[PDB]
Design a binder for these strands. Structure first.
Lengths: 91, 101, 96, 78, 79, 97, 103, 93
DNA sequence: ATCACAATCCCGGTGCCGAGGCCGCTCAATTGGTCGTAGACAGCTCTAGCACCGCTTAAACGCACGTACGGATTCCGTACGTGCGTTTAAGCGGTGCTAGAGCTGTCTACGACCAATTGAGCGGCCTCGGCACCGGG
DNA sequence: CCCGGTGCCGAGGCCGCTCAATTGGTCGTAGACAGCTCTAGCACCGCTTAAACGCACGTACGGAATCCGTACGTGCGTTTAAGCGGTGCTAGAGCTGTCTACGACCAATTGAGCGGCCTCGGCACCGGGATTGTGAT
């Protein structure tokens, strides 16, 4: 069995565009793309945890990793979406 | 209810949490909201790329997003251009003929 | 009936800046990669996807290098690119 | 030699794609040397990755890993 | 003003160390803009690293880590 | 009035500054610039002195490398005097925005 | 009886091992012969840079390696220049003036 | 508030190659940072190389391949030679 | 060519901080022995990579021809470079003060794990609808 | 470049199986925290040489202009080997099982590496002849 992000991309696409499908090569492109962003965020979070000597990885490590990686308005809006998700999840 | 459903995200919060455990810490803990924040970030970035690519495809009048459309959308937006410095197979080049020519 | 320099060049520029196809014959490039890897480890095999990926990467690399070289040449108030422009691009990029 | 397999029209086509109007006649040997060096680097890294896994077939993933190592990450081939 | 404090003789000395023999009259403002952009880029990460530790003092290590992030690793202030 | 020829004193300065290794900016103005830059990102900050010292080392090394690239660009165009356009070409070739 | 003495090195096998286990992923294990290799590698690299910088210092007839000698040794060899791409603090540059400027 | 550093072993190596040539505290800081950076690079590559092959143990094979991946030609040859010598000496005892 | 002349290199004394040595001691490398689990060694099968044949036929290739373009030459105009009298803002040095880093001793909230359930996620498959090459204006 | 014709393979929805995401009870443990101490960041003055700033001035330099010679681009006819297809064949990539051989955990313990204290010797700051490129003759 080979794991993939093929779902959660078809769903996001069918929600942003209720009428546009995606091919099989573009699916590989976006699998690799999501994998790369996840790798970068995970690495930065691990490095922050090692820097500040906190054994656990909290939401704050993710927040600072997003702020360091993503530039400008992208970072701001991504941080907003993450905080919205966390606030909804806690309740 | 699924953790993704409670978090209100389409991405797998549980699977992302497992991946964070198996790829991101020496010997330690991953907070439960860490997976929620990571999934929300991934969802946002993917949604932005998908919206831009779909806009390009609609401008080109086609019902499928292809690597050419992904390349057009990625290079078009400044923030996405700065975030993604990779090579896209079958993506081509953006036309730009210099004025001096 | 003939043409003059700069016409067919721009026509080809437009015709090749819009497509997505590969711009090297696949068999000669495959022979090249097999010969290059014939010294690191003898009796080696490859995969079709591996050689295709190597070709895509090399094409992207050379197109980017030619963009940088064209900028370097246009800097000197020129239209023709020469080895000095390539060497300048690769020295500034740190590739040497 | 198979480095000559990069024919003159191929180099001219890459140059046209890049936006080059005129091309000196000495450009071709320089581009052949450039391509040979780049291929040598990537192929060495991918062969080391393959040899680590006790293998005799260079798949696409080895090439993608080698390309990512140099800072030239490639999407959509593994 | 606080950006003219990087004076014309200072930019001239920085240029001379690079091997520059003649300097145009517009080089100074361009180099001031370049330096301001670079300093903003690195300090935007130094302050973020400091904030993540709930601190008010920007220790040298925050700057060194921020520099290593941008691919300009600096030797002699950490380790 | 010895009145050296224009150009023969610049080479001596080149030799002198490439032989020396100290810092080449007054410390107080660079400290003030760093404070003014970091003020807008977050108010009421405080700096270890080594923070500003490392920042100045980084800035000087960056500018020296950039000027070497600009000199190469200028010598390319059959010139002796570096120009803003050569700085721009250098910063464009190496990808720095 | 110490592990590094058993491997015949100067760098510590034990501390390097302990620092390795702090970097491997969850459930990661560090072979006791990985620390040996890493200690040998670090010793070799340090020995190379030290020999280069020492020679650069004896060129100037001094007894103290400083940042200047480290930069002169790093940028004076192609391998170390390619491997080390850092900013040695207080190292200056390598003195070199082009030929299109000299009268 | 103990702080650990690679200074003692750096000094031992320096006295091994240059017995009568010293080192400055600024150079000691430089070389502390150099050893730290190189070790971090090698360790990260070894970890990723173990991860790719679906392993969990970081063996000397992983370190050897990491050195071969981040060290230029002749440096790679000599470093791998030294590491192999050390490992076959250690396994002897 | 030959040479005055500012500037650079070349040695020399000096005293002043920093490198290198030396103890005290606390922390952490090291020894020894369970048990357990990841990983090496042996088999199996069938996927997919190497090899050979023949067509054909789209791309490379070698020669002919002429024109646009890069290189040398010439001429000034001016914008950088040199030197100097003068001022302004850095550089120490000492005193005064204290915000905030840094350690500690509690403890209380979060996260890893296990038994069990079950519900979402991949491999098949069965099609029809976006599409790519036509062919022409 | 801009609309049709057409036969298609590519994308997508339905289907059954499986494996990992979700409760739920422990439970050991890490970081929020309040407090205390004390360093080092910040502020203010005072002199004191020194780098900056503005100005006069004459030379090298960037930039436009003119002019030939030539070497890249364009066209044509003729190879020439790349691309398809078809069939053979087997070499090892990938999955399964088994058995063990190193690496983790725990307890006691002992030496190695930090922190502080101290001293002479190397690097720095400079005075005085030696000699060396410069610029006008």
């Amino acid at each position: 069995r080979k794991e993939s992000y093929s779902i959660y991309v078809y769903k996001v696409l069918k929600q942003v565009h209720p009428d546009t499908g995606i091919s099989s090569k573009a699916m590989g492109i976006m699998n690799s793309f999501v994998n790369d962003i996840f790798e970068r965020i995970a690495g930065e979070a691990s490095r922050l945890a090692h820097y500040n000597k906190r054994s656990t990885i909290t939401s704050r490590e993710i927040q600072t990793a997003v702020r360091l990686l993503l530039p400008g308005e992208l970072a701001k809006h991504a941080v907003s979406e993450g905080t919205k998700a966390v606030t909804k999840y806690t309740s | 209810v699924s953790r993704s459903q409670r978090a209100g995200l389409q991405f797998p919060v549980g699977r992302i949490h497992r991946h964070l455990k198996s790829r991101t810490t020496s010997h330690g803990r991953v907070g439960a909201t860490a997976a929620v924040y990571s999934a929300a970030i991934l969802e946002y970035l993917t949604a932005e790329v998908l919206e831009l690519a779909g806009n390009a495809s609609k401008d080109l009048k086609v019902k499928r997003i292809t690597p050419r459309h992904l390349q057009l959308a990625i290079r078009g937006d400044e923030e996405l251009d700065s975030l993604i410095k990779a090579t896209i197979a079958g993506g081509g080049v953006i036309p730009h003929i210099h004025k001096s020519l | 009936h003939r043409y003059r320099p700069g016409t067919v060049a721009l026509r080809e520029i437009r015709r090749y800046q819009k497509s997505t196809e590969l711009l090297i014959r696949k068999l000669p490039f495959q022979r090249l990669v097999r010969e290059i890897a014939q010294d690191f480890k003898t009796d080696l095999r490859f995969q079709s996807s591996a050689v295709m990926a190597l070709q895509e990467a090399s094409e992207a690399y050379l197109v980017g290098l030619f963009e940088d070289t064209n900028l370097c040449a246009i800097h000197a108030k020129r239209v023709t690119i020469m080895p000095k422009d390539i060497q300048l691009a690769r020295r500034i990029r740190g590739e040497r | 030699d198979n480095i000559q397999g990069i024919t003159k029209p191929a180099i001219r086509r890459l140059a046209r794609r890049g936006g080059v109007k005129r091309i000196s006649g000495l450009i071709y040997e320089e581009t052949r040397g450039v391509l040979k060096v780049f291929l040598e680097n990537v192929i060495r890294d991918a062969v080391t990755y393959t040899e680590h896994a006790k293998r005799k077939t260079v798949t696409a993933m080895d090439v993608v890993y080698a390309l990512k190592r140099q800072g030239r990450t490639l999407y959509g081939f593994g």
